[PDB]
Amino acid sequence: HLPPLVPGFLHLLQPNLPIHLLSLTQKLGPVYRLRLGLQEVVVLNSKRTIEEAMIRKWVDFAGRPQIPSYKLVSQRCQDISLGDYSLLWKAHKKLTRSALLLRSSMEPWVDQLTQEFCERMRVQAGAPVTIQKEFSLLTCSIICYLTFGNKEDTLVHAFHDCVQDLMKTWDHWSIQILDMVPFLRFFPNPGLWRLKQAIENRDHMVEKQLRRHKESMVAGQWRDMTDYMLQGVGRQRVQLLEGHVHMSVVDLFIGGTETTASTLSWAVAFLLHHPEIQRRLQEELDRELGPGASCSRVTYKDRARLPLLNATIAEVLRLRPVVPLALPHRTTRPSSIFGYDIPEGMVVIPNLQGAHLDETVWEQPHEFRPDRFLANPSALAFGCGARVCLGESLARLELFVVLARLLQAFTLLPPPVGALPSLQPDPYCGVNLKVQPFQVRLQPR
């Protein structure tokens, strides 16, 4: 009783890994044991199994393996994501998550921060690279209501830059091999140096800030979330050590920026190929709950007042989920992940991307199809896990507020004498990437 084994030794190499983990499915089925690295890792490729070992069992495949690459960022140690399970992490998640849920509703700021962006782009009328503009749109936003609420392009462009440079340094064979070949002796490798050096800015920018927060403190929450966490820790009613706050900020402070940006960028790349969905959206937008051209409705309760949107976003998050294989889960108790018994400690890899192409539940999976509301099944882009996501709300929101006014203000047009991007890069890393388009950005309603 155990999942099958694929006869390979470095499946990790090879393009479009998510589409490959799917290919093996033709014979094996949803669950198969595979060697992504040098160790046999059990994958899952179906909305059913990837949900059974995530929601049903819950207790079992909830932890995360500590590989020699995670404890590299441990510092004092502990935190969201990388950190393993343990009762501390549980209470650690609940604290840094309630912050994102917050007398200071983050709803308004988001809808405003994006407006400034529209104008900033509206003055361009040229061919700005969307990736940075939006890749900086969210940064200008998570930075306002999470750490000292600076928002200033002086402290934002500094934190935003720390994000991108903190990614290509963690997701590079140079630093990855260290995990596959631990016995390596860690002969000096160039990548490790570039990481340790860039990982400091991430530790420093939070240390120099967390202090200002410490002193400028009052009875409740300061402008930002830091004041909440940095306070909701030194008052625990009985671990949750002070250091935890330093890390909790990181995921959101410098983690919020990349993931959501990619989703937004991907969506734009799709509308470029489908003008149909673009204008059908422009009409369904104002002729649905926005008879005007601005500052009218466009929110939460209304959120239903916009069908094509709640749909378009659902597709983009299903065809190109920003995080595809999500993160590696580890088993704590021997349990069955379906079909076959699974040994404890076994690293589980929930193939989200693949489960989204299950043609047994989603029709014409490969085809951008906005339509689904009526209704079509749900697609897990944020996982469904005791780890689920810690900011699924913030994310889901930005994709609504940003896209909404993105269409209304501008046309969304292709670069001059250029080809539209798409299809997905082979250098798939922690978060799924995108090619570099140059969308035009104009409209005169």
Ligand code: HEM
């Ligand atoms: C809509 C864009 C996003 C997508 C598709 C996405 C997807 C995911 C996925 C698949 C995971 C791993 C789930 C697991 O395997 O257990 C994850 C984890 C996480 N995400 Fe996101 N995410 C998005 C946006 C965000 C944003 C904007 C934030 C910042 C508030 C965020 C913060 C996190 C954190 C902190 C974790 C780690 C949770 C843990 O402790 O396990 N995500 N996300």
Ligand SMILES: CC(=O)[C@@]1(O)CC[C@H]2[C@@H]3CCC4=CC(=O)CC[C@]4(C)[C@H]3CC[C@@]21C
């Ligand atoms: C148990 C082990 O030997 C490891 O922890 C050491 C190397 C780990 C790779 C690292 C790269 C990677 C990136 C992803 O996004 C999905 C998960 C994998 C494939 C992950 C699987 C578990 C591996 C193989």
Ligand SMILES: CC(=O)[C@@]1(O)CC[C@H]2[C@@H]3CCC4=CC(=O)CC[C@]4(C)[C@H]3CC[C@@]21C
């Ligand atoms: C998009 C997502 O899923 C996340 O935002 C949720 C967890 C985030 C980890 C958090 C830990 C970390 C520490 C660093 O110093 C470098 C950046 C990472 C690897 C960072 C990458 C983006 C991730 C994976």
